[PDB]
Amino acid sequence: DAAIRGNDVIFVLKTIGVPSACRQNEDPRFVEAFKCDELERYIDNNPECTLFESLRDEEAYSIVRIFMDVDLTAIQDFIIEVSNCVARFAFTECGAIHENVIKSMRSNFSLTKSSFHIIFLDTYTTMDTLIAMKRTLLELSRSSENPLTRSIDTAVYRRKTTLRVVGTRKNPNCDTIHVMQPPHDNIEDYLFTYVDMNNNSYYFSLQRRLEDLVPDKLWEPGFISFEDAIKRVSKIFINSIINFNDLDENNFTTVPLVIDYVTPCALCKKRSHKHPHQLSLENGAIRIYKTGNPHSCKVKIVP
């Protein structure tokens, strides 16, 4: 909870792929620190420019706003879905309040037409939260088939990030600019390094003092296996299985299952398959194959 110290200075880079030599040395041709009033004057002075946004020092200050880049009812449902998805994490471990999050994210946003950028005015968090759930956003985009969710880019969440300033072209050769969308007019409504406190917003982070050590163990979360998938595995084998009595996701792969044969084999046409069978998981796909000589049987995949 920094609270007291307010971030109004904007850190701008003037070259994509800037050499690392004259970047931390405060080169006037690559790095500048401007404010609200000077930015439009600089834009007026230089008709052609390429300006990207960044942070002063990620180690010291890493407080940003939640933003998305996509490349009326559709966006109306998209905003609600995104708010619910992030509120799930906010209530998961953040120690925050879901009601505060949904109140903060409600009807307070901006739009930009070039592929559009969304920044939430009254939502402040720390960049490690953004780096934590790029995978969650990707999973949400993949699982759902919503119009605007299908093209969400999670590659923008990284360290030393860059966000193109509205009205600044990628290159002088290109003729594509960001057209500002009403009712927002001032540049301060499109600055993801801008921080304020208006006795209505909310701040959330991991809040349990982790140094990006959240992943403790990802035990292949296909533990719906209670009777859905494991019964499918027992369905492909017509003959009875004896080790089926007690199974768990912990011993899901390590145990060599031994079955009994009274009718000829299911996967192939052989006799009793003396070497025990075995199971593996890859890319969320269940794989079944025979130990010893795998060429004496057939590998079967179950989604």
Ligand X SMILES: Nc1ncnc2c1ncn2[C@@H]1O[C@H](COP(=O)(O)OP(=O)(O)OP(=O)(O)O)[C@@H](O)[C@H]1O
User: Which residue, among 193, 36, 183, has the nearest Cα to 111 in the 3D structure?
Assistant: 183
| Distance of closest approach, residue 157 Cβ to a copy of itself, in angstroms | 8
Residue 48 is which amino acid? E
Nearer to Zn ion, 95 or 294 (CB): 294
Residue 286 is which amino acid? I
Q: Looking at residues 226 to 265 of the shown chain, list those that interact with Zn ion (rule: CB under 5 A).
A: 265
The residue whose two tokens read 């939430």 is 120
Does the protein bind ligand X through residue 159 (CB under 6 A)? no
Does the protein bind a copy of itself through residue 284 (CB under 8 A)? yes
Does the protein bind ligand X through residue 253 (CB under 6 A)? no
| Distance of closest approach, residue 167 Cβ to ligand X, in angstroms | 12
238 token code pair:
């017509």
Catalytic choice (153, 228, 246, 260): 153
Taking CB within 5 to 8 Å according to partner kind, which of ligand X, a copy of itself, Zn ion, none is near residue 140? none
99 token code pair:
């009601």
Count of residues touching Zn ion (by CB under 5 A): 4
CB contact at 8 A, 68 and 81: no
Alpha helices, DSSP H only, in the chain? Answer: 36-45, 73-92, 98-105, 127-132, 134-143, 229-236
Q: Looking at residues 119 to 148 of the shown chain, list those that interact with a copy of itself (rule: CB under 8 A).
A: 131, 134-135, 138, 141-142, 145, 147
The residue whose two tokens read 């006795």 is 199
Across 155-294, where does the E strand assignment appear? 163-164, 179-180, 202-204, 277-282, 285-290
Q: Is residue 260 annotated as a catalytic residue, yes or no?
A: no
Nearer to ligand X, 35 or 231 (CB): 231
Does the protein bind ligand X through residue 54 (CB under 6 A)? no
- For residues 205 and 107, give the distance between their C-alpha atoms in angstroms, rounded to a whole number: 22
- For residues 290 and 239, give the distance between their C-alpha atoms in angstroms, rounded to a whole number: 16
Decide: residue 227, CB within 10 A, 0-12 exposed, 13-18 middle, 19+ buried.
Answer: exposed
Does the protein bind ligand X through residue 135 (CB under 6 A)? no
| Distance of closest approach, residue 62 Cβ to ligand X, in angstroms | 17
| Distance of closest approach, residue 140 Cβ to ligand X, in angstroms | 17
CB contact at 8 A, 239 and 259: yes
- Name the site residues for ligand X (rule: CB under 6 A): 69, 71, 115, 153, 155, 158, 164, 230-231, 234, 240-241, 244
- Name the site residues for a copy of itself (rule: CB under 8 A): 16-17, 72-73, 76, 131, 134-135, 138, 141-142, 145, 147, 150-151, 153, 155, 158-159, 212, 215, 218, 231, 234-235, 238, 240, 245-246, 260, 262-264, 269, 280, 282-285, 287, 289, 294-295, 298-299, 301, 303
Show which residues are catalytic: 153
